[PDB]
Structures are given as C-alpha cells and as structure tokens.
Nucleic acid binder design. Structure first.
Length: 159
RNA sequence: ACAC
C-alpha cells in the first residue's frame, strides 16, 4: 500500500489549508503536494513513508487548530481496512512476548514486523487472520496504557 | 465521519 498518504481529521468547520501549512511547517514535516481540505477532514501526501510516520507521531492528538487537536493517520480507503494494523508508541525496551500476549487476545497473528523509527518508542505492523479480529484489536488496544505508554493503533492498507 |  501507499504509506506516504495522510488523512487529517478532527478539523473545525473553517479550517483552512493555510492552517495546516502552518502546523506542518512548524513541525518541520515536508509535504509533496497541496493540502486538500474537505469538511472536518483533509488529505496531504508526504515525500515518503518515513516522513508520513514522523507526521503522525509528531502531530496526531498533539497540535491544536482553533483549540481542537488534529488527528493525523495513514490514509486508508474503507475497502482496504481489513486485516492489517500499525501500532505505535510502544515502550522502547519491551519484548515480543509481552506485546504478543496482548495481540493474541483478538485473533491469530499471521505477520508482525517492526518498523524502523527515529523515536525511542517502537512501531510495528501487524496482520491478523480476519477483518473481525483486526477491528476488535484496534478497538481494545488503541488507547491502552502499557508501562505508562499509551498504545496507538490504526489501519494500514490491506492489499 | 477517508476524497461526487
């Protein structure tokens, strides 16, 4: 899947592209095209998946527009929201078994691969065996506090 | 709330 495309959500009715330009400028995140602002959400592409990930980590839930914290996520069309998830803000020196002991509560883990990342926290992509499993895992693990880190879970494109 |  195309992992450099971002979805930006939780925007106020009169969010303008200039607002998003400013936010990305100050976070030192390059974009490769213009911001496309709809109603309450928007889209923009980054030059590559590394910048797109840095944007999610730096911005999402963290920077405000008109007092509303923006959401920044991988852009994933509904038909590609199936089995695959990305988990971020994992405590740095956590070991597989502890993470795994969480993951298997929601189904069978076909694949799990760690993502290279600037931050001290870890990031992994996970493939479950069905759409239903992945949805439950997202619903119960997003926001889960683990060794004082808040896990963040979201869809990445599935084929 | 993921693009007439």
């Amino acid at each position: 899947g195309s992992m450099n495309k971002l979805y930006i959500g939780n925007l106020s009715e009169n969010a303008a592209p200039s607002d998003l330009e400013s936010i990305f400028k100050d976070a030192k995140i390059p974009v490769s095209g213009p911001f496309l602002v709809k109603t309450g959400y928007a889209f923009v592409d980054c030059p590559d998946e590394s910048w797109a990930l840095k944007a999610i980590e730096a911005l999402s839930g963290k920077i405000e527009l008109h007092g509303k914290p923006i959401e920044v996520e991988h852009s994933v069309p509904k038909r590609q929201r199936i089995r695959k998830l990305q988990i971020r803000n994992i405590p740095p020196h956590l070991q597989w078994e502890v993470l795994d002991s969480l993951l298997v509560q929601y189904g069978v883990v076909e694949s799990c691969e760690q993502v290279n990342t600037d931050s001290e926290t870890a990031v992994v992509n996970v493939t479950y065996s069905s759409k239903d499993q992945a949805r439950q895992a997202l619903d119960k693990l997003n926001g889960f506090q683990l060794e004082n880190f808040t896990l963040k879970v979201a869809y990445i494109p599935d084929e």
